[PDB]
Symmetry: C3
Subunit: 265 residues, 3 copies
């Protein structure tokens, strides 16, 4: 990949950044492990009463829309407002956007507070951009449609980078459009791959990387962990285990990023 | 096993059914993974505000009694009523029935809404049938006692199949009594085997299988995954990993179901 | 280790003790598995409405301060009061103590009810003892400072054993001061090692062991599982898997405890 992104220097993380995750109860054990496996320090606290003291210590924040409830709604909106008040680097992951009105309402509010990164899968982001969601949507036509939609969003949210994940990943900012083409289809066959990509982005933001760099490196690294894992694995449980294991190993190969496939458009 | 159940055709699932799990926070990561490993699509949302929109999309529902709380109680009773109003295929898993009055009260209400399948372990189901719970209860006498008790229940709940899990599994409907004898004792030595069997039943119901077929195939497949896993495993963590891994592999053997042991009584 | 602690007899557990965990949602799947892997029987129920009936059945209780919320606060304080009223053996794990006032307030209340064991990492326990938390704090000076601080606490809480975990582990009671030196640094690189040590202590208390014995054996066994796991492992996911696996295997070596390193001071 012909790119401005300086991959050689991303890993290992050296500041042990504290990454606070206001996240769902389904994938949180694995999100905490992911973050530790790349030398970040996870904290999963979400009680608003702690925010003043916590936010002083954290380097970045994950606001994950998954498994909504009245309690998670209070935390998410409280953390989003507060993150805006104190300029906390923030990744918003629109898990389930489009599933219901209530999710959409909460999701829209998070994005309105102008986070560092907004993230989702193709379906969620298309829905966020008010496009139809019919895959047919991974076509070159549909990708170009979403790129344009996301570029219109970055005009309203000019300090926010948008990430849509899929067979190809689409990253859009006010400055760049990047399409990435790593990973394997088995990365859809265990729970939390999207959630963990969110946490990895936050981790890189917290270490000090620029937003598009954080997004491109997090997605690339995780997807290349999948690629390696597929070669070593038989069965999906085993494939999952190896992907998570690679988070701590792929790093050690001086030239892991040579496998990155993607265009800056 | 001399049986009417057409195992050859159960796997692989081809409709990618969306299975909604209103379940406990202990085993939910593994329930989501289980469902993905057999090509179902898990959704763990439980906020009643979403139900109208979600229920339009889901193919089957898991209502798991585990880790009760006031929030889980509202979700469970709301989902149970609504599932009845719209005839959603539903598996009720009476995790912990007998532990407390409050669990029993919630549990009874779920069963009163007449789900497709009611499930628990021997102890829970015996208690549900108002039998003593003293194992002594896995004896041929005690099994025959429970069969009769469950047959009396299917008279009140004639559209519901009952599953009691154990060394031997007991399945009772208004039409059939089946005893299954697969699995290994190590399937009691990691958390969630019962919970995942519930989710697998829902998955098969959602794909389109008849209830007793769904129950018999889910239990058999999971227990045969255990049998295979034991031959490859040393240590319980390792045994767990391999059981979960087999969910995605055993399927691929054209004749996995030849290992099924059980009588139609 | 020259010690009064009779390790030969700790494992295997033979009473299948029921250990109730009022714990965080991050590491609970693994805490339940841990307990099963050493032949305890986990129950993760935390609704106060069940306590009267549950407490009749449980052998020991884990009160984990992690992932605080208004719901977890009610459960924790309710369970702590009740455990005191009925003399339930209780392990209090001060996860996150020092992070916020609200955590501290809840934590102090748990310790004020005089549990069997209070546990945390060096940082948390130092903060509990009102010491500064700057590692510099693992020095021989800082260890001696904490020992003295903990001895002053056991004067207020003379029926409570205190455990501070780290490179070296510090155990203090009114009768003994013990420093342990097993484990490997990778035990900080997956989530829940501290949480699981808490559950293991409870498990040994529930089986019938004296408090300091329970604490010393739980910490030693878990840390020696890590030591073995490191020799078999490549990558952190893999190291985690093997540590958890060893919980069920190391036991089987007649002389596992010969590897224990530590002084009674
Ligand atoms: N079919 C695929 N081929 C290659 N990479 C994939 C595929 N599906 C998902 N991924 C990758 O795995 C990660 C998870 O993305 P995705 O599954 O789209 O998230 P979600 O869990 O929110 O639906 C992303 O980094 C994505 O690039
Ligand atoms: N001792 C055993 N031998 C064979 N199969 C077992 C044994 N214990 C449990 N199983 C199987 O494992 C699955 C889990 O059942 P069980 O452990 O009874 O559920 P629960 O977790 O609700 O107590 C069931 O399909 C059951 O048939
Ligand atoms: N660097 C280390 N070297 C040896 N053992 C360790 C190390 N770090 C942690 N442990 C051990 O692993 C277990 C987890 O302790 P710790 O990581 O301090 O808990 P927490 O998760 O609460 O911070 C303890 O039994 C401790 O002795």
């Amino acid at each position: 990949m012909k790119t401005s992104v300086k991959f050689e220097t991303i890993f290992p993380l050296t500041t042990a950044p504290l990454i606070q995750c206001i996240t769902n109860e389904i994938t949180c054990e694995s999100m905490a492990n992911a973050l530790l496996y790349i030398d970040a320090k996870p904290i999963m606290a979400d009680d608003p009463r702690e925010f003043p003291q916590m936010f002083q210590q954290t380097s970045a924040l994950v606001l994950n829309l998954g498994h909504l409830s009245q309690e998670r709604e209070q935390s998410l909106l409280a953390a989003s407002d507060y993150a805006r008040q104190v300029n906390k680097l923030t990744v918003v992951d629109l898990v389930g956007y489009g599933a219901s009105d209530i999710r959409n309402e909460v999701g829209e509010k998070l994005v309105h507070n102008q986070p560092t990164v907004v993230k989702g899968n193709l379906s969620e982001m298309r829905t966020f951009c008010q496009l139809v969601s019919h895959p047919l949507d991974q076509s070159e036509e549909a990708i170009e449609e979403l790129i344009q939609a996301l570029r219109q969003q970055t005009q309203k949210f000019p300090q926010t980078v948008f990430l849509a994940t899929g067979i190809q990943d689409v990253l859009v900012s006010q400055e760049q459009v990047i399409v990435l083409q790593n990973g394997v289809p088995e990365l859809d066959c265990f729970t939390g791959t999207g959630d963990l990509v969110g946490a990895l982005v936050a981790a890189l933001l917290g270490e000090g990387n620029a937003p598009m760099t954080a997004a491109v490196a997090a997605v690339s690294y995780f997807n290349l962990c999948g690629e390696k894992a597929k070669t070593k694995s038989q069965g999906l449980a085993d494939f999952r285990q190896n992907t998570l294991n690679q988070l701590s190993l792929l790093m050690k190969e001086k030239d892991w990023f040579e496998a990155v496939k993607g265009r800056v458009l």
